[PDB]
């Protein structure tokens, strides 16, 4: 509706920043879109694509998720809540996937990236799925610079919603691997203040958040199972003009409420 568009424009104005939204309602194959073809820095939401690239690779290498990866002090970056507990030991690729998706562990992300061949390989995986917008340019932590106008480490809301639908509800991944990604995302510990905060308590959500720590950039990408309804995919990206702007997860929650009200 023009109503929902008006409400998103008003939310964006009040917030002082730039808001990107894409909702896919699988009940009727409809979309609600707001700046959905503009580029936004992904921040940690890019962890979904890295984990999915490793899952795709595991379809032809059954030992892969069990493969051990050394964690060293030289691997630590800016935020390592799980990896810091395993320094001088190993973690499996499954454990790194869960740490990246459920705790936003940046060492875990770098190990997933390295395993598949680096940022260009994560990007080539996205291209193989039919996503010609996603670009992972850098590793952690520098992928988070979020400079306005910089296309590095960005995607569009439309593209990420369509790709997340393919990954979690479609056939991008084999049945076991799809189920594994959904289980990982449903087990996220970091998303209650974002999309989930704008949805009824009963709805079931798998999501990955991302706060770059620069330009107050605050994002969330989610698969949503409303009570007794077909699932939704919702992507909400937000970034602000000031380099040291504070995070605005409430803006993502407000957008989520606007685009789902009535469902
Ligand atoms: Cl409620």
Residue numbers in the entry: 27 to 289
Question: From the publication, what sentences describe this entry?
Answer:
One possible explanation for this is the presence in KPC-2 of a Cys69-Cys238 disulfide bond, a distinguishing feature of carbapenem-hydrolyzing class A enzymes. As carbapenem-hydrolyzing class A β-lactamases also contain a single amino acid insertion at position 240 (compared to the equivalent region in ESBLs such as CTX-M-15), we constructed an additional variant containing an alanine insertion at position 240 (CTX-M-15G238C/G239_Y240insA) to more closely resemble the equivalent loop in class A carbapenemases. Formation of a Cys69-Cys238 disulfide was confirmed by determining the crystal structures of both mutants. Note that the CTX-M-15G238C/G239_Y240insA loop is structurally similar to the equivalent loop in the KPC-2 carbapenemase, in which cross-link formation following PAS exposure is not observed. Neither mutant prevented cross-link formation, as evidenced by the presence of a peak corresponding to a mass loss of 18-Da on 24 h of exposure to tazobactam or enmetazobactam. Thus, presence of an active-site disulfide bond is not sufficient to abolish cross-link formation by CTX-M-15 and does not account for the absence of cross-link formation in KPC-2. As a further investigation of the importance of active-site movement to cross-link formation, we sought to constrain the CTX-M-15 active site through introduction of the equivalent disulfide by directed mutagenesis. This, however, did not affect the ability of mutant enzymes CTX-M-15G238C and CTX-M-15G238C/G239_Y240insA to form cross-links, indicating that differences in disulfide content (and possibly a concurrent reduction in active site flexibility) are not the explanation for the differing abilities of CTX-M-15 and KPC-2 to support cross-link formation.
CTX-M-15 (cefotaximase-Munich-15) is a class A extended-spectrum β-lactamase (ESBL) capable of hydrolyzing penicillins and cephalosporins, including third- and fourth-generation cephalosporins such as ceftazidime and cefepime, respectively. It is predominantly plasmid mediated, disseminated worldwide, and encountered in diverse Gram-negative pathogens, mostly Enterobacterales, but occasionally also in nonfermenters. CTX-M-15, like other class A SBLs, employs an acylation-deacylation mechanism to hydrolyze β-lactam antibiotics, utilizing four invariant residues: Ser70, Lys73, Ser130, and Glu166. In this study, ultrahigh-resolution X-ray crystal structures and mass spectrometry revealed the mechanism of PAS inhibition of CTX-M-15, an extended-spectrum β-lactamase (ESBL) globally disseminated among Enterobacterales.
